[PDB]
Amino acid sequence: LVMSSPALPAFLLCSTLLVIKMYVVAIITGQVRLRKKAFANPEDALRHGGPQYCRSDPDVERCLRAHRNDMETIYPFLFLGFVYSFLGPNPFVAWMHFLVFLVGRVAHTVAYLGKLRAPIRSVTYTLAQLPCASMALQILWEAARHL
Amino acid sequence: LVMSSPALPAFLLCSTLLVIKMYVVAIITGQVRLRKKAFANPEDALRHGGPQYCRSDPDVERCLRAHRNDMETIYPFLFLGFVYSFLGPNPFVAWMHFLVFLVGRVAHTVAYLGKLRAPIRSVTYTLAQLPCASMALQILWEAARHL
Amino acid sequence: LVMSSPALPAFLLCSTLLVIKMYVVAIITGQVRLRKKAFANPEDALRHGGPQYCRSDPDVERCLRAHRNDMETIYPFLFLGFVYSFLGPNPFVAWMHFLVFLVGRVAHTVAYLGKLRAPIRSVTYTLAQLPCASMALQILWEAARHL
Ligand SMILES: CC(C)(C)C(=O)N[C@H]1CCC[C@H]1CNc1cc(Cl)ccc1C(=O)O
Ligand SMILES: CC(C)(C)C(=O)N[C@H]1CCC[C@H]1CNc1cc(Cl)ccc1C(=O)O
Ligand SMILES: CC(C)(C)C(=O)N[C@H]1CCC[C@H]1CNc1cc(Cl)ccc1C(=O)O
Ligand SMILES: CCCCCCCCO[C@@H]1O[C@H](CO)[C@@H](O)[C@H](O)[C@H]1O
Ligand SMILES: CCCCCCCCO[C@@H]1O[C@H](CO)[C@@H](O)[C@H](O)[C@H]1O
Ligand SMILES: CCCCCCCCO[C@@H]1O[C@H](CO)[C@@H](O)[C@H](O)[C@H]1O
Ligand SMILES: N[C@@H](CCC(=O)N[C@@H](CS)C(=O)NCC(=O)O)C(=O)O
Ligand SMILES: N[C@@H](CCC(=O)N[C@@H](CS)C(=O)NCC(=O)O)C(=O)O
Ligand SMILES: N[C@@H](CCC(=O)N[C@@H](CS)C(=O)NCC(=O)O)C(=O)O
């Protein structure tokens, strides 16, 4: 049940929103492929104009990079945040961890796909990693002391 | 324990089968690399014929795309389906969610690696995403109402 | 709580260390990008010397491959190992599963980024996959018998 720990509802809200955000990136990628006529597969290209459309595109590649960075960061959060929710952290402190990650990651996607000037994207990445590092260390201590 | 919720055994069966399915894709990728003599690393190439075999191959790239799409879809399911199992959904309805994803994703890999005509692969992707979207929204409501 | 099962603390220790190890790979990737002046984005390149630095680099690509292989292997472990911890396995046997994966994966990153001769990296990959396959099969039987 969602009320297994005081921090769990907040974690589940933020995590699920971020999963949906990743799904949005996937949809955008597909739409960009269609609009720019840039497909990764010959079977896709032949359906949508001909073999010349099996090609790379800078905007498609950008979408893929944003999606991959999401996989490099959001997936670890899904694990760390879940475990962290059951360590009995301060409700407000836990909320701040999840919110900083949520805001940081949404901002990251906006900065990436919106082609915002450096180092905006890099800063959003680093900001979002901070609560992840914090949770990781807290889990390490709790796990180690229970060995 | 597996009987913590009525939907959990079905989720664990489908998810673990899909993880194994991803492992199979990894093995296939390696086998294709060896057969087509197309390695990503100079150290691999020098062991298997010479430096000229550090090269890209369309079939290897296809395998990597299928594997990456798995990571973009199956990993979120592992999270969403687990949480969803504990929300007390209708046993049959939950089973249908997991089965549609399982069948959709297996079909996706067959359509991708088998080079089936468009839009077969795209349809299997979309079909499998439907129960994921459904579970995501259900988790959102449950999490939000417990805040 | 961490003491929900005898195997859980060991799992959480190994998994969190591996997540941190992935974060280290991400940091290394960024550092290599800066040192070799090889950026994936024009906005990054213009900040760090000019448009000519939006380019690929073999060392950066190697870092990305190591990170991707981590995503292909460590993420499934996070799921499998968590579920496996609650199946009531022998404490020592469970510990061995987690340790073999931890050692195998750390060795994999060292072998990859350190450019060690073949088949060292391939062996570390295979070694680490063994406990994952073992856990997957055990989960399959437990899930199937509870249907
Ligand atoms: C949202 C996604 C699916 C990611 C997207 O927009 N993908 C695009 C990239 C290449 C294929 C294209 C989608 N094409 C189709 C998809 C379906 Cl479900 C049915 C019919 C077609 C068709 O081509 O008629
Ligand atoms: C199933 C996997 C491991 C993914 C696969 O078939 N990988 C292939 C891609 C490039 C390396 C090659 C596997 N090579 C080896 C692997 C081991 Cl464990 C021992 C010895 C060798 C050898 O080269 O003698
Ligand atoms: C550790 C990471 C963030 C992955 C890394 O070393 N990334 C490098 C790859 C390209 C951008 C570069 C980091 N640049 C910055 C990052 C911040 Cl938080 C603030 C200012 C700058 C700056 O450029 O002044
Ligand atoms: C959850 C998905 C987040 C969507 C954020 C997309 C940001 C789009 O932002 C757009 O980027 C374009 C360049 O790509 C610019 O030309 C436009 O000025 C800008 O509005
Ligand atoms: C879990 C892994 C799923 C394996 C599905 C592989 C589908 C292989 O399918 C094969 O594809 C070839 C083109 O690649 C065709 O030439 C063959 O006719 C076809 O049998
Ligand atoms: C958790 C991250 C693991 C870091 C392992 C990095 C291994 C670095 O190893 C280095 O590799 C270089 C080639 O890249 C060689 O030139 C050096 O001799 C070697 O020391
Ligand atoms: N895989 C990443 C590792 C480092 C990283 O996550 N960097 C952040 C901040 S510079 C980023 O937004 N990278 C862009 C990307 O991953 O495409 C990369 O190659 O850049
Ligand atoms: N990363 C995906 C995002 C969109 C997506 O998942 N599309 C589905 C249906 S067209 C797909 O099978 N993509 C092929 C792939 O990911 O390689 C892509 O580039 O296509
Ligand atoms: N995606 C992998 C699938 C197979 C795999 O995981 N192989 C192992 C052992 S050869 C590996 O270290 N691959 C290197 C990599 O993924 O970049 C690949 O292309 O090689």
Coordinates of N, CA and C in Angstrom, one line a residue, chain C:
Chain C
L1 N 11.7 -1.5 5.9 CA 12.9 -1.6 6.6 C 13.9 -2.5 6.0
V2 N 15.2 -2.3 6.2 CA 16.3 -3.0 5.6 C 16.4 -4.5 6.1
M3 N 15.8 -4.7 7.3 CA 15.8 -6.1 7.9 C 14.6 -6.9 7.6
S4 N 13.9 -6.5 6.5 CA 12.7 -7.3 6.1 C 13.0 -8.7 5.6
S5 N 14.2 -8.9 5.2 CA 14.7 -10.2 4.9 C 16.2 -10.3 5.1
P6 N 16.8 -11.5 5.5 CA 18.2 -11.6 5.8 C 19.2 -11.2 4.7
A7 N 18.7 -11.4 3.5 CA 19.6 -11.1 2.3 C 19.6 -9.6 1.9
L8 N 18.6 -8.9 2.3 CA 18.3 -7.5 1.9 C 19.5 -6.5 2.1
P9 N 20.1 -6.5 3.3 CA 21.2 -5.5 3.5 C 22.3 -5.7 2.5
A10 N 22.7 -7.0 2.3 CA 23.8 -7.3 1.3 C 23.4 -6.9 -0.1
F11 N 22.2 -7.1 -0.5 CA 21.7 -6.6 -1.8 C 21.8 -5.1 -1.9
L12 N 21.3 -4.4 -0.9 CA 21.2 -3.0 -0.9 C 22.6 -2.3 -1.0
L13 N 23.6 -3.0 -0.2 CA 25.0 -2.5 -0.3 C 25.6 -2.6 -1.7
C14 N 25.5 -3.8 -2.3 CA 26.0 -4.1 -3.6 C 25.4 -3.3 -4.7
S15 N 24.1 -3.2 -4.6 CA 23.3 -2.4 -5.7 C 23.6 -0.9 -5.6
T16 N 23.7 -0.4 -4.4 CA 24.0 1.1 -4.3 C 25.4 1.4 -4.7
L17 N 26.3 0.5 -4.3 CA 27.7 0.7 -4.8 C 27.8 0.7 -6.3
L18 N 27.0 -0.2 -6.9 CA 27.0 -0.3 -8.4 C 26.4 1.0 -9.1
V19 N 25.3 1.5 -8.4 CA 24.7 2.8 -8.9 C 25.7 3.9 -8.8
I20 N 26.4 4.0 -7.7 CA 27.5 5.0 -7.5 C 28.6 4.8 -8.6
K21 N 28.9 3.5 -8.8 CA 29.9 3.2 -9.9 C 29.5 3.7 -11.3
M22 N 28.2 3.6 -11.5 CA 27.6 4.2 -12.8 C 27.7 5.7 -12.8
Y23 N 27.5 6.3 -11.7 CA 27.6 7.8 -11.5 C 29.1 8.2 -11.8
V24 N 30.0 7.4 -11.3 CA 31.4 7.6 -11.6 C 31.8 7.6 -13.1
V25 N 31.2 6.6 -13.8 CA 31.3 6.5 -15.2 C 30.8 7.7 -15.9
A26 N 29.7 8.2 -15.5 CA 29.1 9.5 -16.0 C 30.0 10.7 -15.8
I27 N 30.6 10.8 -14.6 CA 31.5 11.9 -14.3 C 32.8 11.8 -15.2
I28 N 33.3 10.5 -15.3 CA 34.5 10.3 -16.2 C 34.2 10.7 -17.6
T29 N 33.0 10.3 -18.1 CA 32.6 10.7 -19.5 C 32.7 12.2 -19.7
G30 N 32.1 12.9 -18.8 CA 32.1 14.4 -18.8 C 33.5 15.0 -18.8
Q31 N 34.4 14.4 -18.0 CA 35.8 14.9 -17.8 C 36.6 14.6 -19.1
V32 N 36.3 13.4 -19.7 CA 36.9 13.0 -21.0 C 36.5 14.0 -22.1
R33 N 35.2 14.3 -22.2 CA 34.7 15.3 -23.1 C 35.4 16.6 -23.1
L34 N 35.6 17.1 -21.8 CA 36.3 18.4 -21.6 C 37.8 18.3 -22.0
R35 N 38.4 17.2 -21.6 CA 39.9 17.0 -21.8 C 40.2 16.8 -23.3
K36 N 39.4 16.0 -24.0 CA 39.6 15.7 -25.4 C 38.9 16.7 -26.3
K37 N 38.1 17.7 -25.7 CA 37.3 18.7 -26.4 C 36.4 18.1 -27.4
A38 N 35.6 17.1 -27.0 CA 34.7 16.4 -27.9 C 33.3 16.4 -27.3
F39 N 32.4 17.2 -27.8 CA 31.1 17.5 -27.3 C 30.0 17.0 -28.3
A40 N 28.9 16.5 -27.8 CA 27.8 16.0 -28.6 C 26.9 17.1 -29.1
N41 N 27.0 18.3 -28.5 CA 26.1 19.4 -28.7 C 26.8 20.7 -29.1
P42 N 26.3 21.4 -30.2 CA 26.9 22.6 -30.6 C 26.9 23.7 -29.5
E43 N 25.9 23.7 -28.6 CA 25.9 24.7 -27.5 C 27.0 24.5 -26.5
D44 N 27.4 23.2 -26.3 CA 28.5 22.8 -25.5 C 29.8 23.2 -26.1
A45 N 30.0 22.9 -27.4 CA 31.2 23.2 -28.1 C 31.5 24.7 -28.2
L46 N 30.5 25.5 -28.5 CA 30.7 27.0 -28.6 C 31.1 27.6 -27.3
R47 N 30.8 27.0 -26.1 CA 31.2 27.4 -24.8 C 32.6 27.0 -24.5
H48 N 33.1 25.9 -25.1 CA 34.4 25.4 -24.8 C 35.4 25.4 -26.0
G49 N 35.4 26.4 -26.8 CA 36.4 26.6 -27.8 C 36.0 26.9 -29.2
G50 N 34.8 26.5 -29.6 CA 34.2 26.7 -30.9 C 33.5 25.5 -31.5
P51 N 32.8 25.7 -32.7 CA 32.0 24.7 -33.3 C 32.7 23.4 -33.8
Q52 N 34.0 23.5 -34.0 CA 34.8 22.4 -34.4 C 34.9 21.3 -33.3
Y53 N 34.6 21.7 -32.1 CA 34.7 20.8 -31.0 C 33.4 20.0 -30.7
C54 N 32.4 20.2 -31.6 CA 31.2 19.3 -31.6 C 31.6 18.2 -32.5
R55 N 32.2 17.1 -31.9 CA 32.8 16.0 -32.7 C 32.8 14.8 -31.8
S56 N 32.9 13.6 -32.5 CA 33.1 12.3 -31.8 C 34.6 12.1 -31.4
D57 N 34.7 11.3 -30.4 CA 36.1 10.9 -29.9 C 36.0 9.5 -29.4
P58 N 37.1 8.7 -29.8 CA 37.1 7.2 -29.5 C 37.0 7.0 -28.0
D59 N 37.7 7.8 -27.1 CA 37.6 7.6 -25.7 C 36.3 7.9 -25.1
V60 N 35.6 9.0 -25.6 CA 34.3 9.3 -25.2 C 33.3 8.2 -25.6
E61 N 33.4 7.7 -26.8 CA 32.6 6.6 -27.3 C 32.7 5.4 -26.4
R62 N 34.0 5.1 -26.0 CA 34.3 4.0 -25.1 C 33.6 4.1 -23.8
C63 N 33.6 5.3 -23.2 CA 33.0 5.7 -22.0 C 31.5 5.4 -22.1
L64 N 30.9 5.9 -23.2 CA 29.5 5.7 -23.5 C 29.1 4.2 -23.6
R65 N 29.9 3.4 -24.2 CA 29.7 2.0 -24.3 C 29.7 1.3 -23.0
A66 N 30.6 1.7 -22.1 CA 30.7 1.1 -20.8 C 29.5 1.5 -20.0
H67 N 29.1 2.7 -20.1 CA 27.9 3.2 -19.4 C 26.6 2.5 -19.9
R68 N 26.5 2.3 -21.2 CA 25.4 1.6 -21.8 C 25.4 0.1 -21.4
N69 N 26.5 -0.5 -21.4 CA 26.6 -1.9 -20.9 C 26.1 -2.1 -19.5
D70 N 26.5 -1.1 -18.7 CA 26.0 -1.0 -17.3 C 24.5 -0.9 -17.2
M71 N 23.9 -0.1 -18.1 CA 22.4 0.0 -18.2 C 21.8 -1.3 -18.6
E72 N 22.5 -2.0 -19.5 CA 22.0 -3.3 -20.0 C 22.1 -4.5 -19.0
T73 N 22.8 -4.3 -17.9 CA 23.1 -5.3 -17.0 C 22.8 -5.0 -15.5
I74 N 23.2 -3.8 -15.0 CA 23.0 -3.4 -13.6 C 21.6 -3.1 -13.4
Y75 N 20.9 -2.5 -14.3 CA 19.4 -2.2 -14.1 C 18.6 -3.4 -13.9
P76 N 18.8 -4.5 -14.7 CA 18.1 -5.7 -14.5 C 18.4 -6.4 -13.1
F77 N 19.7 -6.2 -12.7 CA 20.1 -6.7 -11.4 C 19.4 -6.0 -10.2
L78 N 19.1 -4.7 -10.4 CA 18.4 -4.0 -9.4 C 17.0 -4.5 -9.1
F79 N 16.4 -5.0 -10.2 CA 15.1 -5.6 -10.1 C 15.2 -7.0 -9.6
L80 N 16.0 -7.9 -10.3 CA 16.1 -9.3 -10.0 C 16.6 -9.5 -8.5
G81 N 17.6 -8.8 -8.1 CA 18.2 -9.0 -6.8 C 17.3 -8.5 -5.7
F82 N 16.5 -7.5 -5.9 CA 15.5 -7.0 -4.9 C 14.4 -8.1 -4.7
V83 N 13.8 -8.6 -5.8 CA 12.8 -9.7 -5.7 C 13.4 -10.9 -5.1
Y84 N 14.6 -11.3 -5.5 CA 15.3 -12.5 -5.0 C 15.6 -12.4 -3.5
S85 N 15.8 -11.2 -3.0 CA 16.1 -11.0 -1.5 C 14.9 -11.5 -0.7
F86 N 13.7 -11.4 -1.3 CA 12.4 -11.7 -0.5 C 11.9 -13.1 -0.8
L87 N 12.7 -13.9 -1.5 CA 12.3 -15.3 -1.8 C 12.8 -16.3 -0.7
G88 N 13.5 -15.7 0.3 CA 14.1 -16.5 1.4 C 15.2 -17.4 1.0
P89 N 16.2 -16.9 0.2 CA 17.3 -17.7 -0.2 C 18.3 -17.9 1.0
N90 N 19.2 -18.9 0.9 CA 20.2 -19.1 1.9 C 21.1 -17.9 1.9
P91 N 21.3 -17.3 3.1 CA 22.0 -16.1 3.3 C 23.4 -16.0 2.6
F92 N 24.2 -17.1 2.8 CA 25.5 -17.2 2.2 C 25.4 -17.3 0.7
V93 N 24.5 -18.1 0.2 CA 24.3 -18.3 -1.3 C 23.8 -17.0 -1.9
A94 N 22.9 -16.2 -1.3 CA 22.5 -14.9 -1.7 C 23.6 -13.9 -1.8
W95 N 24.4 -13.9 -0.7 CA 25.6 -13.1 -0.6 C 26.6 -13.3 -1.8
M96 N 26.8 -14.6 -2.1 CA 27.7 -15.0 -3.2 C 27.1 -14.5 -4.6
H97 N 25.8 -14.6 -4.7 CA 25.2 -14.0 -6.0 C 25.5 -12.6 -6.1
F98 N 25.3 -11.8 -5.1 CA 25.5 -10.3 -5.1 C 27.0 -10.0 -5.2
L99 N 27.8 -10.7 -4.6 CA 29.3 -10.4 -4.6 C 29.9 -10.7 -6.0
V100 N 29.5 -11.8 -6.6 CA 29.9 -12.2 -7.9 C 29.5 -11.1 -8.9
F101 N 28.3 -10.6 -8.8 CA 27.9 -9.5 -9.7 C 28.6 -8.3 -9.4
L102 N 28.8 -7.9 -8.2 CA 29.5 -6.7 -7.8 C 31.0 -6.7 -8.3
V103 N 31.7 -7.8 -8.0 CA 33.1 -7.9 -8.5 C 33.2 -8.0 -10.0
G104 N 32.3 -8.8 -10.6 CA 32.2 -8.9 -12.1 C 32.0 -7.6 -12.8
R105 N 31.1 -6.8 -12.3 CA 30.8 -5.5 -12.9 C 31.8 -4.4 -12.7
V106 N 32.4 -4.4 -11.5 CA 33.5 -3.5 -11.3 C 34.7 -3.8 -12.2
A107 N 35.0 -5.1 -12.3 CA 36.0 -5.6 -13.2 C 35.7 -5.3 -14.6
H108 N 34.5 -5.4 -15.0 CA 34.0 -5.1 -16.4 C 34.4 -3.6 -16.8
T109 N 34.1 -2.7 -15.9 CA 34.3 -1.3 -16.1 C 35.9 -1.0 -16.2
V110 N 36.6 -1.6 -15.3 CA 38.1 -1.6 -15.3 C 38.6 -2.1 -16.6
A111 N 38.1 -3.3 -17.1 CA 38.6 -3.9 -18.3 C 38.2 -3.1 -19.5
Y112 N 37.0 -2.4 -19.5 CA 36.5 -1.6 -20.6 C 37.3 -0.3 -20.7
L113 N 37.3 0.5 -19.7 CA 37.9 1.8 -19.7 C 39.4 1.7 -19.7
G114 N 39.9 0.6 -19.1 CA 41.4 0.4 -19.1 C 41.9 -0.3 -20.4
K115 N 41.0 -0.6 -21.3 CA 41.4 -1.1 -22.6 C 42.2 -2.4 -22.5
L116 N 41.8 -3.3 -21.6 CA 42.5 -4.6 -21.3 C 42.2 -5.5 -22.5
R117 N 43.2 -6.4 -22.7 CA 43.1 -7.3 -23.9 C 41.9 -8.3 -23.8
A118 N 41.4 -8.6 -25.0 CA 40.3 -9.6 -25.1 C 40.9 -11.0 -24.7
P119 N 40.0 -11.9 -24.1 CA 38.6 -11.7 -23.8 C 38.3 -11.3 -22.3
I120 N 39.2 -10.5 -21.7 CA 39.0 -10.2 -20.3 C 37.6 -9.5 -20.0
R121 N 37.3 -8.5 -20.7 CA 36.0 -7.8 -20.6 C 34.8 -8.7 -20.8
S122 N 34.9 -9.5 -21.8 CA 33.8 -10.5 -22.2 C 33.6 -11.5 -21.1
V123 N 34.7 -12.0 -20.5 CA 34.7 -12.9 -19.4 C 34.0 -12.3 -18.1
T124 N 34.3 -11.0 -17.8 CA 33.7 -10.3 -16.7 C 32.2 -10.1 -16.9
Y125 N 31.8 -9.8 -18.1 CA 30.4 -9.7 -18.4 C 29.7 -11.0 -18.2
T126 N 30.2 -12.1 -18.7 CA 29.6 -13.4 -18.6 C 29.6 -13.9 -17.1
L127 N 30.7 -13.7 -16.4 CA 30.7 -14.0 -15.0 C 29.6 -13.3 -14.2
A128 N 29.4 -12.0 -14.4 CA 28.4 -11.2 -13.7 C 27.0 -11.6 -14.1
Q129 N 26.8 -12.1 -15.4 CA 25.5 -12.5 -15.8 C 25.0 -13.8 -15.2
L130 N 26.0 -14.7 -14.8 CA 25.6 -16.0 -14.2 C 24.7 -15.9 -12.9
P131 N 25.0 -15.1 -11.9 CA 24.1 -14.9 -10.8 C 22.8 -14.3 -11.2
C132 N 22.8 -13.4 -12.2 CA 21.5 -12.8 -12.8 C 20.6 -13.9 -13.4
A133 N 21.2 -14.8 -14.2 CA 20.4 -15.9 -14.8 C 19.9 -16.8 -13.7
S134 N 20.7 -17.1 -12.7 CA 20.3 -17.9 -11.5 C 19.1 -17.3 -10.8
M135 N 19.2 -16.0 -10.5 CA 18.1 -15.3 -9.8 C 16.8 -15.3 -10.6
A136 N 17.0 -15.0 -11.9 CA 15.9 -15.0 -12.8 C 15.1 -16.3 -12.9
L137 N 15.8 -17.4 -13.0 CA 15.2 -18.7 -13.0 C 14.5 -19.0 -11.7
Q138 N 15.1 -18.7 -10.5 CA 14.5 -18.9 -9.2 C 13.2 -18.1 -9.0
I139 N 13.2 -16.8 -9.5 CA 12.0 -16.0 -9.5 C 10.9 -16.6 -10.4
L140 N 11.3 -17.1 -11.5 CA 10.4 -17.7 -12.5 C 9.6 -18.9 -11.8
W141 N 10.3 -19.8 -11.1 CA 9.7 -20.9 -10.5 C 8.8 -20.5 -9.3
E142 N 9.2 -19.5 -8.5 CA 8.4 -19.0 -7.4 C 7.2 -18.3 -7.9
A143 N 7.3 -17.5 -8.9 CA 6.2 -16.8 -9.5 C 5.2 -17.8 -10.1
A144 N 5.7 -18.7 -10.9 CA 4.8 -19.7 -11.6 C 4.0 -20.6 -10.7
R145 N 4.7 -21.0 -9.6 CA 4.0 -21.9 -8.6 C 3.0 -21.2 -7.7
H146 N 3.0 -19.8 -7.8 CA 2.0 -19.0 -7.0 C 0.9 -18.5 -7.8
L147 N 0.8 -18.9 -9.1 CA -0.3 -18.5 -10.0 C -1.6 -19.2 -9.7

